[PDB]
Design a protein around this ligand. Structure first.
Ligand SMILES: Nc1ncnc2c1ncn2[C@@H]1O[C@H](CSCC[C@H](N)C(=O)O)[C@@H](O)[C@H]1O
Length: 206
């Protein structure tokens, strides 16, 4: 129900390109060590934790979290991205459980089961983002961590201030927020203050 079929078709159409490091998803590949490092730091490590990756797509974050010893469920509504995720995980020799369903359906069946829920670059593609925020809150264990982010911009952006309003209506507490910026001194992208055009948000279930 809470799905934009057009948005899904778009990602389904480019699913084969997902793991091309120089293709359309290059920014996600480049960003991933950073968000993975952020998640591991904020959640206090990922080893042996149950982790749900909402709108996992081709599995860029999901696979990498499983590599750190997390028990990862990847969720998406796109058929082809999940086919690609499943195959790529097998090619890597990494175990990830990939499922095709909405986060609301998953929440109704798996409430409170996850130590960590990640929801990256997904919200802007959803007809009703508040519902996704509510589901993530429902999915997470007490004391669990929920992360939201939009680190990739191009040619629909949910402002962080608006997302905070959504988080405030749930059992999730905002813990930390940071932006992604180019650092000329180090010639690298780094997480830091300033969320005008992108962000990463750490919330914790209370
Ligand atoms: N309503 C919905 N339910 C589940 N997945 C959705 C969705 N709307 C969009 N998506 C998925 O969200 C993904 C956005 S691309 C982001 C991929 C991944 N989260 C990452 O950052 O690495 C696409 O795979 C798309 O199919």
């Amino acid at each position: 129900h809470n799905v934009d079929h057009e948005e899904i078709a778009k990602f389904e159409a480019v699913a084969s390109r997902w793991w091309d490091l120089e293709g359309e998803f290059k920014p996600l590949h480049r960003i991933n060590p950073l968000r993975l490092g952020y998640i591991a730091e904020r959640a206090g490590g990922l080893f042996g934790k149950k982790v749900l990756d909402v709108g996992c797509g081709g599995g860029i974050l999901a696979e990498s979290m499983a590599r750190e010893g997390a028990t990862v469920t990847g969720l998406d509504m796109g058929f082809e991205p999940l086919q690609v995720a499943k195959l790529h995980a097998l090619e890597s020799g990494i175990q990830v459980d990939y499922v095709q369903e909405t986060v609301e359906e998953h929440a109704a069946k798996h409430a409170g089961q996850y130590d960590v829920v990640t929801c990256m670059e997904m919200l802007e593609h959803v007809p009703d983002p508040q519902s996704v925020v509510r589901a993530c809150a429902q999915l997470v264990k007490p004391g669990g961590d929920v992360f939201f982010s939009t680190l990739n911009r191009n040619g629909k952006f949910i402002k962080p201030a608006e997302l905070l309003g959504w988080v405030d209506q749930t059992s999730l507490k905002e813990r930390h927020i940071t932006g992604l910026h180019y650092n000329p001194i180090t010639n690298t992208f780094k997480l830091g203050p300033g969320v005008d055009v992108n962000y990463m948000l750490h919330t914790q279930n209370k």
